[PDB]
Write a protein that binds this ligand. Sequence first.
Ligand code: 6GC
Ligand code: 6GC
Lengths: 208, 208
Amino acid sequence: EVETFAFQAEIAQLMSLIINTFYSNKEIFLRELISNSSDALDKIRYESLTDPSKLDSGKELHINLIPNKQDRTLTIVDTGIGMTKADLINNLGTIAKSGTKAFMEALQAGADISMIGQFGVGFYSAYLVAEKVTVITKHNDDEQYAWESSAGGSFTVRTDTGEPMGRGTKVILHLKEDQTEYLEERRIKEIVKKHSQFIGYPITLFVE
Amino acid sequence: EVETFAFQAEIAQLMSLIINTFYSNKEIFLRELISNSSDALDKIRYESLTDPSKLDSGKELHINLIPNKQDRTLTIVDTGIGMTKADLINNLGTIAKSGTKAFMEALQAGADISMIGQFGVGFYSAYLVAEKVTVITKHNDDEQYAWESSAGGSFTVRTDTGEPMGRGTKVILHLKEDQTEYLEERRIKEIVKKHSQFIGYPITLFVE
Ligand SMILES: CCCCN(C)C(=O)c1cc(-c2n[nH]c(=O)n2-c2ccccc2F)c(O)cc1O
Ligand SMILES: CCCCN(C)C(=O)c1cc(-c2n[nH]c(=O)n2-c2ccccc2F)c(O)cc1O
């Protein structure tokens, strides 16, 4: 029931660079994921002006940060517009082809990994801290899907039979052994305050 | 043939603040407009993956900067997705209600006008340099419209009978008398290099 796909060549190369480069300031992953959540929330909010029934699958527009020391996971949940199967498999890979090329050029021109979000590919900064990422997503117009990748040049997509979520996206970061700092309450608080303080949606940091 | 509308109260108040505050670093207007053009170009590019006929109204995705010393205008043109009448009159005012409130709060909390784009209302930084703004826009699904405002709490919209443009948005900044520096080639070049160097579309600075 599980489809396996190869990444575009440029994305696979971006992911290797992110995993292999020595770069200490890994905490920027969180801002990039919160930023993408915010954009997804903007999208469903705007669509709902012209069609209030888009919020039948959920009225609240918000972001939850959920650390889990047992599973060694950090989960970022939003109730944004979600993603279709086509988004996961094809559409986002395609726009990320040019953004990756632009980004990798700038890095040669001296730029630093922290500028990744200006090229549209800030999601892949998750692999600074995660050995595996799972994405569960639900768009009004499609079914619930699980996307997963451990960054070896391939990703999987399946229909998700797990617990339904209504509308939005959940990003489950399976953290590397030496990156458990991002499960601690004061570390996450520090990072959100420093990088994400002007997001226009509630950000709730769950306690354990 | 011309409809006159009142701005939302919060936007009218944002515009007065932008016009009345002493703030020397006015050049940030250009980055905000180029940023919105880029977002509009992203939108039509993405829509065209799932429906290549959206580019029948124009294949090229680009940004032109056109100074005109005679008319004292600076025009920013893009071939992005364009805006519907509903966008101009109602939809963008509504999302800009919360962004304005958020922004004006931050300014009390010390923030500075240069952060306006983080709240979604960066367009209104045009009134740092313009006494009047005209917006001509064409969306695939609607007709060509002219929006105009001289920031006295009202704006006008009409159907544009002028020369058709295909798809996109043109922003015509009627500059204040003491802001002609933004018509000079070396000044515009300087600003684009400093603030807009990583935009993923061609930016062409027309000569006079
Ligand atoms: C193929 C792998 C994808 C990686 N992921 C999960 C993301 O980028 C990502 C995407 C969304 C998302 N839902 N709906 C939507 O439009 N977006 C979206 C937002 C911003 C840029 C692009 C987007 F598609 C989100 O809410 C959270 C995310 O972390
Ligand atoms: C009511 C007054 C509006 C002010 N203007 C002209 C802008 O903000 C503005 C808007 C667009 C635009 N075309 N299509 C589209 O989606 N956008 C858009 C882009 C970014 C945020 C919001 C948007 F609607 C542009 O290409 C250039 C602009 O300067």
